[model samples]
Target chain A: SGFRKMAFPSGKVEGCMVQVTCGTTTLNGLWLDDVVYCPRHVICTSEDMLNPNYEDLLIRKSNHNFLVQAGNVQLRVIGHSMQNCVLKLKVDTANPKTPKYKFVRIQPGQTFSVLACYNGSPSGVYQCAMRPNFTIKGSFLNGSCGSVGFNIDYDCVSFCYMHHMELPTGVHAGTDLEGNFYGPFVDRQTAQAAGTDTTITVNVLAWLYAAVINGDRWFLNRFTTTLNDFNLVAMKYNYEPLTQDHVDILGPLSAQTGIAVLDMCASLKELLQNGMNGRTILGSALLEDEFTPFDVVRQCS
Target chain B: SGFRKMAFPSGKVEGCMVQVTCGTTTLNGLWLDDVVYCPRHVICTSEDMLNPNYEDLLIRKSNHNFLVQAGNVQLRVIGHSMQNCVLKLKVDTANPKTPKYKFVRIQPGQTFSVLACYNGSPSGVYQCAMRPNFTIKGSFLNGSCGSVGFNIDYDCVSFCYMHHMELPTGVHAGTDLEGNFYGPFVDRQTAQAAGTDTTITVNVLAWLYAAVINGDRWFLNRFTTTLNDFNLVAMKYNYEPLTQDHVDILGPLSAQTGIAVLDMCASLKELLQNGMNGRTILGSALLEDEFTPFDVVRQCS
Candidate 1:
């Protein structure tokens, strides 16, 4: 009857602690913050029994007698005697990079936990914040255990959004109605290639498609207004720099997809023709200081 | 011949595109941006050949004859005839939450790829960005595929930091030289209890110690300046709030750990004594309003 399994938020360092001291006859469960150990039956230490969430753990310990101290955190024990006992724990978990970290999936509406301390010890969980179901915005604390103590802070990151699509098989290489060249995704006997499976070939077009569905917000958030900026974007991700051929095909692909992409290609050509001091079709100034096309953007998916 | 396994960043949604059409005699390789397919050789579509990374995939198809298009993106093929062919892919990989999402554990110093798009088609991998040593700081772009196109931006997040520790078994419950109860970590035969394992019982004291090693920077980043702020800290993570017993035990535990914790506990007591409109021992004001001690903080560690 010890504390059961629990998980902390991801991206943050967190862990669970298990500790035990043997005693005769009685199996008691006690807690001090995150500790969830079995002192007598020692069965609590079994990895099989401990790995699942807490309630399931108790079911396994059924038929065994233990006290639910419940002293704030609910732990207790009453034994036949104090002869010999055992303890088990796995809480040294602070590293977020490790597989052992008790990371929670964090169901969108699940309760989020917050903890604090003074001089390195716990004060148990508080009974606040969970009411009224408010979206967790953020948190911060003060002090330190080394000297004084400290606090915790957090901010709720909004849901991430993205869109997706894939091309047809034999259609790997196809020229649009204008027969210029396929958009980034197509390959052919002569156009681009026959087999394209190299990390070197990235889907810039895919990333761009994602940016499209959400409005210009992604760009507004990511780009600074500049002419060279647009030019730099054009120069990025090209194994063989842009050519009239690639641009010529965009018009047909744009019409087929009902997506306006030709303008974007033309803008890049504009930047190349206008040079570093040029502007985009939208008239935004180019921000390219030295024109490093390699450091720019990818084709929209 | 065909492309093989690959993965992308974790936060962003990513995918693989696999498609097949029948062809004869020749097994050809082709690509357009991210596609790596087998034009004629249906074997390339054999899940086995396409699951591993490209090199291993080539080894598997060793005896087979396929041309390397090498047309910028390197894809090709030629065979006995154009009879029947096949292509297979698994790139519909945009959903990050799905188990199928191919995620890479970006090694600290690995090459980070950046791409750009012109109206939604790729330019392939550029021969830039990875040159000369420079930590990736950030990036930004303009436009969108829906309208024009879009760009990508990213900032390498610095390493995360945290400290960890656990108390001794026999020491779960103890009394100090001055003969007070034990610190937050130690339970008790009587001081607190014999068993303590529950999420409710947070090791506030542990978190405090962590704050100590790192500087007050954490607090500086998290807490806002205010009297009520300090008091609010005092009211956090406590099962029974703060009590004289907890404060008294701090003295001896401090001496044993060689860490000064008494002052921190004492200050918390001061905040309580001062009431909602009061100041802490450190003279910081309590940010408590109606005094909901629930949403404040947790025990260190």
Candidate 2:
């Protein structure tokens, strides 16, 4: 065989093992290899091996936006339904494969709070669901525990916490990985109605880098060859070839952070174009603010 | 011998020969293989193999745009120098490698329309140049023929041709493959002064398709992975990873003709925002019209 295939016939790769934490308790025999292939799967006690589904516990109560109490990581949900509601909360420690749910019975207008007493990292996704009456036929109202840690670095965590808030003074807000900003607009509808911005900005930057940089030959070859093939197809259809001007326009927004500037201008232009709506002093604070990929890391941290 | 390389020792691989049309005449040895490998490069008698240089005759004539007659593909250049201008025109059929330039002598105000009587395809790019008074100047005005065929399907040809025309009663006159109509604004300076539009829109569409399409997977994978790696770097710096909301924004304009509609709205919004003098009906009819990729093919055809 030209290529060697590594195998674990006895079920865990020999000499490959690592420690995985589950709250205050640590689990051993969790092979560095995936659990599917590890012989110890049947006996693995790692929380990472926990089954990842546990809904009907985290987001059931609609009465209030839940906030966790850091010391023990607890959040409260008020019962708002006219009838008594039985609420369930699920928490998965490191053993996400084997999640545990705690059930709560709440009277109308009463509140129920759940707490996680895990001593390890509190990093996990929680889902909640509930039933009005234990006899009610339909499925429970589903929700999730949207709690994150003091130093979490996940998009879902940040979005859950910050997506509702607009930038303090103006529109410019969050940046994606390649530095394309989320907005200079308040919401999706406004951004769409204006219709100038798109996630394509970063891809354009990528292509620009590919086309011009020597180290980016892989992208350049892929891009130019594909376009050449496209032109060959055009030739098959009796059409003319492409020109240099097509490549020229993409030159400006080629850098890692270039999209941020372009995003600001485009977003501001959209807002201004829609109308000041009695608000003058049309200027961009974002135009003065600058960001690079490194800056993204700083902000995310 | 890790990688096997395909070798074509002879001119072309056997059974790979194909006919290549050049105007009314056909060049037999134009191999299906590329010219770099085809032996016909040494013997092919097609004008396309003509050397792609000659820039001193056609553009020298500042009178007006010239159109060629069918009998012979030829155009007159009105000589306007203080002395005699020796002009030349070069045409390539399928043999652009070794081109032949035809020279002509024309006096002041005298038009030298050199006729191309070759029964080959008129698809070759033409370049014209000249020596004025045979010696008085370094060079004469030089330019290339920008004319293309009807029923054309190339982006450049269409862009070069229709780029001057404004949207007809609507703001969706152009396309992304072609250039979008961002103007009807006073001028580039004014457009920039207002900060309304840029060439960023079309590039955005190109990237959108490039980022998501299966055919463009290499690009998508390369682009997103690098961004992923960048985010990992962000993680190293303690930053949050990105989410799907970024991709969701570019959804509507992901198709072939979708950018046209978006371009219209964006362009109009910019104009309106910049406070176009006295224009009240600053709406886009394109927002109401619908189109598909078939529409793009039809329009290009």
Candidate 3:
């Protein structure tokens, strides 16, 4: 009879019950569309790089010599493409009714890789952002030429609870909870590139409390890169057969890094635009380096 | 009797309207200390530059020649400082019981400007961010020498109602609202200097809808630099005298641009890192330029 709703036939109030919500789970009163609508955070937040599609740099008018010569900043690397691609994406959709998306397109030559939305153990911080030199080695669904399209949405049982997130090096491919398809125990780390000099990092809630209940040495390759296609679409919408400690902690899954984790996070944005020269950083900031929000890559399958 | 409470002697329903909310205006439901708390957006969002306080560049330790010379990205302008400095600020208290702040300090030889929190007609988008070469001329509270300090807070009647901003150049020094001080309509232009070859711009909601009822010709110098001291503490707390159409369109106020508006928004973050070499851009993207939020500065005092 009040907000978030709840009144049914027993009360003098009009029959209702309403209250659905997901992520934090209220999950039952009787809801449909968004049933009471609830959310805390939903993000596909990408774009750590962009600027190439000017009809592919004005049909390469020699990229107009990447621009401005005389005063010399050395033609200041023009629209700055040359690494860090997968352009387009600005949906914050940060918590609220949850569900979110953004899928870019590319064909005229080709480019787009954010590992087409890694379903590997993601609930919280899944990452994306690309574009760059060596044109993200092969494109489309899994490397080498093909039009492009991205992936995203929301729902586990009804909504993305707090999005569990406990991944960083990946391949335990697991998700679609609330229905029955868990994930992530892995934490694997060998990917590193944003301005390197070999310093690689990843905290991820202390690598998920030191892989407690088991996991760290790449649990089935970060569950075949983030929950093997949301547990194969939650085992084809639930026909079940995965059990056995989820196949004794994962043993299968793939699309192969053929740019998985989006070509190791677009090769950490093309190793921070090719180690901004001086062979990759080791010290201070980007708001003071090492704080951690996940996202960093280069294992490029 | 529970959340956001509201009832009183008029009903046996207990007693109270604990709702205090502000910004969308609820102001009181008996609020003495943030009853029911309401808000919609409060941001000072600064840091479009920062990095020169390694204890002021390690007492000149030749800043180790700002470092990494050889393998050139042109020694990639180390910790990028020479422009954009007022560094430090990361509070996104975004809507919810309003009120926010961030003030930095500097003295050992100089630097710190962001027009020390301009108040001119700001209820929204009052920008800040600075630091860079020609060491922002005079140091301290108005130019050359003074142990610097930044400014910020939040309030007005009760909370910041979508912070009604209509300024882009300053002087009015007006702000304080809920106590009635008011500010901005002016918006000056002539302040370009970042990698210049010139294209300088400032749309700010089509310059506040073509300065509609007035302004676009510097409302008396952006109200003596953003509502002269919150309309002189709102004319010493309501002694009134300002309502003649806001001093019939701003007239008095100052501290003079001793690098005010924080040295014209730290000269638009050192004309964007000294116009990122090859003089200022006018074309193609940062999400494709022209999509405004407003902050830019450079009339210094």
Candidate 4:
């Protein structure tokens, strides 16, 4: 009866209870059973035995390039065609108290702009999740409502997590990742070849303080680009009934600039490649009085 | 008894079998309990708890770049600096076994060669620890050892295990890691000034296994301007005194072009950066060309 099992007919050893959440809603998961022969391997990790199939969330977009809108507490975006596409959502409310950023991924190619609306009026710093695959951990950004916009490119996606960041311009300093600054370096060629930057640039400044975090103004100060007409302003709200203004202040900037966010909270591969690293200069900084190659396309018609 | 008042009896376990070679050797190993401590928030583990700061075996070579010798059943080699170096020793009386490659750090400004020798008369494959920090797994060539020499490389303080290589022509694929495979890309001014033509061609026909796993030989072959003619072979390994004279016999007959294993392996990174997938080429097919360039360099020389 020492290492071996004994006949059990009395009370039971209590099992731990867990809560699962998405955005704001929470759900009750399955229960555990000890009624039968509980094999060591099977009993301890039976959660895997109930692995669920991938689900589809119908998130649609109104504009040519994907876009989003914010109201109340959430922001929503469109989904993609890939069956495995899952987005992760995370939030960080820093101003009230700087906490670590949370991460999550969105369903792929599925429609519905990423929503980060609060059930009611809540203050302080808060960020949400968006990444490809089902990875769990991701970098976060510090912004008002939400500052980083993937609406400019089609393939762009970001994983949000909070980090202790300090910047030269915006208060949303801690809201960005290293890759946010460096992805464009080696990827610039790829972007130019695509004639559009499909790659995503994660901004870490948006989820702080439950307020609107706008980087378009701060980014312009760093380096001026010809597309000053299509700069981002700020994202308001924290969750629910996600609308367009939540993503772009310019609203439906253009098909050329389709920005969107994919949740990356559940990805297995830690899909957030190396957080953007290196110094960042704006596309405008490298510009001259005379029009450069990129200027021709971005120039006002 | 309560947690603090618990009484435990002390017990000891002893080794039942022993094997010794050379000088009298005493072996000691640390058990899990003696090395690990679990706490509410953290866990600590001990590494050298077994013998308390005992020095590991060291292979030394004073002047040359490569040194190799064979004992009854073991093969030993002193590698180039602290980079990864391979040692392939064989027991003709028994079946050939693989030798372990090790990397040892030579104090900066010190000089040494990669030295290796075989000692055992066993029949089968063998392996060597490469990085003192990371474990590098090794495998067999065709899963067998015939008239073959195992090879690997020294990068930083890590030796990448090369494959059981077939000897090359003109020169020998003998157990040397370095060779005349240094040009078509040498001469600092020429290589530095002319970027595109930085390729060192080797008549490589032998298939290098690591060349396949890590995909680095392409870079080692075509672009490495810092590769020393002798050091190239020295960095990998040195054969025991009676090692196969493939260079002598194979050379006396038809000239065989030795392929560049390192170049192809290293080039895979560039290929990806240049938009090539890792699975695109057969790990063996990379040896086809000799033209390549060194992608990273610690020192100018």
Using Cα atoms, each model's DockQ against the true complex is 0.01, 0.01, 0.01, 0.01
For candidate 4 chain A, the 10 contiguous residues with the lowest summed lDDT are: A1-10
lDDT for each residue of candidate 1 in A1-301, tens digit (9 for 90 to 100):
0010111221111122111222222222222233333322233443443343434444445333443322233233322222112122223222232222221222111222222222122222111111111122112222111110111222322111000111222111211111122234221112332233211111122222232322321222221324344445554533223344433433443454445454444333443444433212111122211111111112222
Task: Select the stronger candidate by TM-score from 2 and 3.
Answer: 3
Deviation from native of the Cα of residue A73 in model 3, angstroms: 59
TM-score of chain A of each: 0.18, 0.19, 0.18, 0.18
Question: What does the lDDT read for residue A106 in candidate 4?
Answer: 29
Q: How close is candidate 3 to the true structure, as a TM-score?
A: 0.17
Candidate 1: segments with Cα more than 4 A from true spot: A1-298, B1-43, B46-64, B72-111, B114-301
Model 4 stretches astray by more than 4 angstroms: A1-221, A224-301, B1-301
Candidate 3 local lDDT, B141-206, one digit each (tens): 111000111221121112211112222211111112121212221112223232211111222121
Worst 10 residues of 2 chain A by lDDT: A1-10
lDDT by residue for model 4 over B137-242, one digit each (tens)? 1222221111112222331122211222212110111111221111121111111211111112221212222232223333334553222343344333321111
Question: What is the CAPRI rating of model 2's predicted complex?
Answer: incorrect
For the record, the alpha-carbon RMSD of candidate 2 to the native fold, in angstroms, is 28.8
List the candidate numbers ranked by TM-score, top first. 4, 3, 1, 2
